[PDB]
Design a protein around this motif. Structure first.
Motif, PDB file in Angstrom:
ATOM      1  N   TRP A 145       0.835  -1.209   0.000  1.00  0.00           N
ATOM      2  CA  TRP A 145       0.000   0.000   0.000  1.00  0.00           C
ATOM      3  C   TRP A 145       0.881   1.274   0.000  1.00  0.00           C
ATOM      4  N   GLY A 146       0.268   2.392  -0.357  1.00  0.00           N
ATOM      5  CA  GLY A 146       1.015   3.643  -0.399  1.00  0.00           C
ATOM      6  C   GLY A 146       0.878   4.446   0.877  1.00  0.00           C
ATOM      7  N   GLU A 147      -0.318   4.372   1.442  1.00  0.00           N
ATOM      8  CA  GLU A 147      -0.655   5.018   2.687  1.00  0.00           C
ATOM      9  C   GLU A 147      -1.183   3.837   3.482  1.00  0.00           C
ATOM     10  N   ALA A 148      -1.457   4.033   4.768  1.00  0.00           N
ATOM     11  CA  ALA A 148      -2.006   2.966   5.614  1.00  0.00           C
ATOM     12  C   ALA A 148      -3.551   2.819   5.555  1.00  0.00           C
ATOM     13  N   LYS A 149      -4.038   2.042   4.601  1.00  0.00           N
ATOM     14  CA  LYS A 149      -5.460   1.804   4.433  1.00  0.00           C
ATOM     15  C   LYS A 149      -6.270   1.370   5.661  1.00  0.00           C
ATOM     16  N   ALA A 150      -5.781   0.415   6.444  1.00  0.00           N
ATOM     17  CA  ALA A 150      -6.528  -0.051   7.606  1.00  0.00           C
ATOM     18  C   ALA A 150      -5.705  -0.007   8.847  1.00  0.00           C
ATOM     19  N   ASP A 151      -6.407  -0.201   9.950  1.00  0.00           N
ATOM     20  CA  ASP A 151      -5.865  -0.153  11.302  1.00  0.00           C
ATOM     21  C   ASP A 151      -5.597  -1.546  11.860  1.00  0.00           C
ATOM     22  N   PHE A 152      -6.006  -2.566  11.142  1.00  0.00           N
ATOM     23  CA  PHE A 152      -5.770  -3.865  11.681  1.00  0.00           C
ATOM     24  C   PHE A 152      -4.572  -4.565  11.039  1.00  0.00           C
ATOM     25  N   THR A 153      -3.653  -3.796  10.468  1.00  0.00           N
ATOM     26  CA  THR A 153      -2.499  -4.416   9.825  1.00  0.00           C
ATOM     27  C   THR A 153      -1.271  -3.616   9.931  1.00  0.00           C
ATOM     28  N   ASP A 154      -0.152  -4.254   9.649  1.00  0.00           N
ATOM     29  CA  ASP A 154       1.089  -3.507   9.644  1.00  0.00           C
ATOM     30  C   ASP A 154       1.294  -3.116   8.206  1.00  0.00           C
ATOM     31  N   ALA A 155       2.155  -2.140   7.978  1.00  0.00           N
ATOM     32  CA  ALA A 155       2.359  -1.712   6.617  1.00  0.00           C
ATOM     33  C   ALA A 155       3.758  -1.281   6.256  1.00  0.00           C
ATOM     34  N   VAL A 156       4.208  -1.705   5.099  1.00  0.00           N
ATOM     35  CA  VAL A 156       5.486  -1.260   4.650  1.00  0.00           C
ATOM     36  C   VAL A 156       5.060  -0.388   3.483  1.00  0.00           C
ATOM     37  N   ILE A 157       5.660   0.798   3.419  1.00  0.00           N
ATOM     38  CA  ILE A 157       5.364   1.795   2.383  1.00  0.00           C
ATOM     39  C   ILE A 157       6.585   2.335   1.561  1.00  0.00           C
ATOM     40  N   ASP A 158       6.436   2.260   0.233  1.00  0.00           N
ATOM     41  CA  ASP A 158       7.445   2.600  -0.755  1.00  0.00           C
ATOM     42  C   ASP A 158       7.662   3.996  -1.276  1.00  0.00           C
ATOM     43  N   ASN A 159       6.805   4.951  -0.971  1.00  0.00           N
ATOM     44  CA  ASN A 159       7.070   6.295  -1.454  1.00  0.00           C
ATOM     45  C   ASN A 159       7.117   6.333  -2.995  1.00  0.00           C
ATOM     46  N   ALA A 160       6.276   5.526  -3.625  1.00  0.00           N
ATOM     47  CA  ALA A 160       6.251   5.466  -5.072  1.00  0.00           C
ATOM     48  C   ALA A 160       5.843   6.771  -5.721  1.00  0.00           C
ATOM     49  N   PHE A 161       5.591   7.752  -4.885  1.00  0.00           N
ATOM     50  CA  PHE A 161       5.220   9.069  -5.350  1.00  0.00           C
ATOM     51  C   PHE A 161       6.527   9.828  -5.448  1.00  0.00           C
ATOM     52  N   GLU A 162       7.346   9.788  -4.398  1.00  0.00           N
ATOM     53  CA  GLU A 162       8.599  10.514  -4.461  1.00  0.00           C
ATOM     54  C   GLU A 162       9.400   9.955  -5.616  1.00  0.00           C
ATOM     55  N   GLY A 163       9.118   8.693  -5.915  1.00  0.00           N
ATOM     56  CA  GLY A 163       9.767   7.991  -7.004  1.00  0.00           C
ATOM     57  C   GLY A 163       9.276   8.577  -8.304  1.00  0.00           C
ATOM     58  N   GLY A 164       7.958   8.621  -8.496  1.00  0.00           N
ATOM     59  CA  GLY A 164       7.379   9.205  -9.712  1.00  0.00           C
ATOM     60  C   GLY A 164       7.980  10.621  -9.914  1.00  0.00           C
ATOM     61  N   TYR A 165       8.130  11.356  -8.815  1.00  0.00           N
ATOM     62  CA  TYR A 165       8.684  12.687  -8.868  1.00  0.00           C
ATOM     63  C   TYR A 165      10.135  12.702  -9.250  1.00  0.00           C
ATOM     64  N   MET A 166      10.879  11.745  -8.767  1.00  0.00           N
ATOM     65  CA  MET A 166      12.273  11.723  -9.132  1.00  0.00           C
ATOM     66  C   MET A 166      12.320  11.495 -10.624  1.00  0.00           C
ATOM     67  N   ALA A 167      11.517  10.538 -11.067  1.00  0.00           N
ATOM     68  CA  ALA A 167      11.432  10.151 -12.466  1.00  0.00           C
ATOM     69  C   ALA A 167      11.260  11.388 -13.321  1.00  0.00           C
ATOM     70  N   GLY A 168      10.193  12.115 -13.064  1.00  0.00           N
ATOM     71  CA  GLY A 168       9.992  13.334 -13.816  1.00  0.00           C
ATOM     72  C   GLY A 168      11.231  14.274 -13.806  1.00  0.00           C
ATOM     73  N   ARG A 169      11.588  14.708 -12.605  1.00  0.00           N
ATOM     74  CA  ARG A 169      12.690  15.606 -12.344  1.00  0.00           C
ATOM     75  C   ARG A 169      13.856  15.378 -13.287  1.00  0.00           C
ATOM     76  N   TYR A 170      14.313  14.135 -13.298  1.00  0.00           N
ATOM     77  CA  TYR A 170      15.418  13.708 -14.123  1.00  0.00           C
ATOM     78  C   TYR A 170      15.210  14.161 -15.551  1.00  0.00           C
TER      79      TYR A 170
END
Ligand code: HPA
Ligand code: HPA
Lengths: 338, 338
Positions: A145-170
């Motif tokens: 997931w990108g943000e934490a959708k639910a409260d009953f789970t743990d979450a690892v998040i990738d920042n695929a947005f900062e990534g999309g942004y890096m992509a553009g920037r370049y």
DNA sequence: TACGCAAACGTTTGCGT
DNA sequence: TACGCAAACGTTTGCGT
């Protein structure tokens, strides 16, 4: 059969047990004797019998989407490494984005009593968020997931947005202003979120991508082929393409080739994932790297925690993407004016 | 907890059981009542408890080598499909060609009591043939040998020799006489056997491949890169290369490109596996296709057999490779003289 | 006709002595 | 000091009536 061992040995099964799990002291003499039995008898302690008592299977489940996919595939091999070195057994399961298929493995899993649950479902509708939370009892983390959708789970998040942004920037800083994009499914983080990150960087530069320049892919090379083809196959075409993921990219590459265009000579292209052999793409693919390995181990880790340390509260850990410059990209027309 | 269900229901657990597995008639009235419990109580029948009684886990194990590898990866996703549709659970395990690692998963597996055993070990030394046969008790098939190594297993066989031969033939009949080869590990069927098939076709044509034209790969693109590089990087070079497998091929491709040679214009190249996206290699890769899917399902199938039909005698089923003409190859110098 | 009694499956583990 | 008695874990299933 433990009963059989204890007998050849002339000791209680209680004994037999103890030595097998060094859970109390046993006279050497005795200790050996047991092994002796264990060995000739060719004994294999039943994990299910044991599981039934001790209440834990020492096994975990990957409720994944699909495993052939490069991206996926790597994430898995990781998770597997971690299960192994930490005694855990792996149960792989692909629901193929199929609710029924998911409700199934989910259940098979609970019944099989997996200690914790690794979740990688790609799309996540309410209908799925729901099933998922009827197993809140079984410890679990959703590693996609990108943000934490639910409260009953743990979450690892990738920042695929900062990534999309890096992509553009370049691209931006390379001379580019006429850019195209083939994003992944919008119902997916790596899909939507990547795109979004990309578009911000674009608005920031007042680059306006024309809708005829943005084509949806499904993360599969064929979709890449078609998209690129759709793009380059038109009156006006960009000088640069941002590709939602490396295999689609690999697709985009081929077609540009079959249309006699040069990469990056005629069209520059940057992808995303940094898949195991994107370096051997032709040309060597310049992409955004996703820390799949860490993503994997970081997931195991959180689960383990909840598992042993019986943690109740949810958690979420961020992981970070980074630019890898290979050779699929070249200076655009405005590089010199910056 | 079944005891809890039977209680809200006011029926024996015996009942509860029966309805849950439709193993005997139960009054509707009653039947419903049970569900009622099952549901509010939020009941999940323990598969381990059940496994303990009925004696079978309804789960199977893949003692594989590695799963990220394209080839592998696909074979697995197949096997998984088959487990699912046939109620089986999948236990994935990678020994990485590591004896200890193997002796381990092997054991974890037996203890976990997998119903049957899928084996894909790549290299198979005596030391391994041995461990493997101490579990002859657990039904199992090795889906990666060329001939039938042992008598205590079932076997699916690929004819990777007829494949190597087809590979050569093609080149031969295309105008080629100066050919090179980067084979996979000789301690492997897909390695050795493919090569052999290739060499026969060659002896048959009196083509003599010079040893400076044959370079070992490890099935990994990097090895392909290096090999090709080693080949083209020399006074005299072939006009055609046979590559032990598609990803190495993908490697070979890149390097030829980085050395400014053209494929197939300057060098023709044919690979082997027909991996999922070899069509999107650049150029579209011409290769030998290995029926991984069938290979998978064919393996599940034999196992299932032994499993339910309690078969004792070994079996072996052959599967067949076939030429797929894409565009990495071109007419050699002698095409017209044939 | 429609259902229960109770033993068994292979381990672990608390109280012993 | 070094070990056993026996009950329990959650199901299934044969003989009942
Ligand atoms: O959903 C996905 N599928 C395949 N590759 C991917 N890389 C990022 N997201 C994905
Ligand atoms: O051992 C192997 N590894 C990877 N790919 C392969 N394709 C055939 N054999 C192999």
């Amino acid at each position: 059969t433990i009963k059989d061992v204890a007998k050849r040995a002339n000791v209680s099964t209680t004994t037999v047990s103890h030595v097998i799990n060094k859970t109390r002291f046993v006279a050497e003499e005795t200790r050996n004797a047991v092994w002796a039995a264990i060995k000739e008898l060719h004994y294999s302690p039943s994990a299910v019998a044991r599981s039934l008592k001790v209440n834990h299977t020492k096994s975990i489940g990957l409720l994944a989407t699909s495993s052939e996919a490069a991206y996926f595939a790597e994430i898995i091999e990781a998770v597997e490494k971690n299960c192994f070195q930490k005694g855990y057994t792996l149960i792989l399961g692909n629901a193929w984005n199929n609710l029924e298929k998911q409700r199934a493995y989910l259940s098979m899993m609970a019944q099989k009593r997996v200690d914790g649950l690794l979740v990688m479902c790609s799309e996540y509708p309410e209908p799925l968020l729901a099933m998922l939370e009827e197993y809140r009892h079984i410890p679990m983390v959703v590693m996609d997931w990108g943000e934490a959708k639910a409260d009953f789970t743990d979450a690892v998040i990738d920042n695929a947005f900062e990534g999309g942004y890096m992509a553009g920037r370049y691209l931006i800083e390379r001379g580019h202003r006429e850019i195209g994009v083939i994003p992944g499914p919008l119902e997916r983080n790596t899909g939507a979120g990547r795109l979004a990150g990309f578009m911000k960087a674009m608005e920031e530069a007042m680059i306006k991508v024309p809708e005829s320049w943005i084509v949806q892919g499904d993360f599969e090379p064929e979709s890449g082929y078609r998209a690129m083809q759709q793009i380059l196959s038109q009156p006006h075409r960009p000088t640069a393409v941002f590709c939602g993921g490396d295999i689609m990219a690999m697709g985009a590459l081929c077609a540009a080739d079959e249309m006699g265009l040069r990469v990056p000579q005629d069209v520059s292209l940057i992808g995303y994932d940094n898949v195991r052999n994107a370096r051997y793409f032709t040309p060597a693919l310049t992409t955004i790297h996703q820390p799949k390995d860490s993503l994997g181990e970081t997931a195991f880790n959180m689960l383990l925690d909840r598992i042993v340390n019986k943690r109740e509260e949810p958690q979420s850990i961020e992981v970070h993407p980074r630019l890898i410059e290979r050779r699929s990209v070249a200076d655009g027309p405005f590089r010199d004016y910056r």
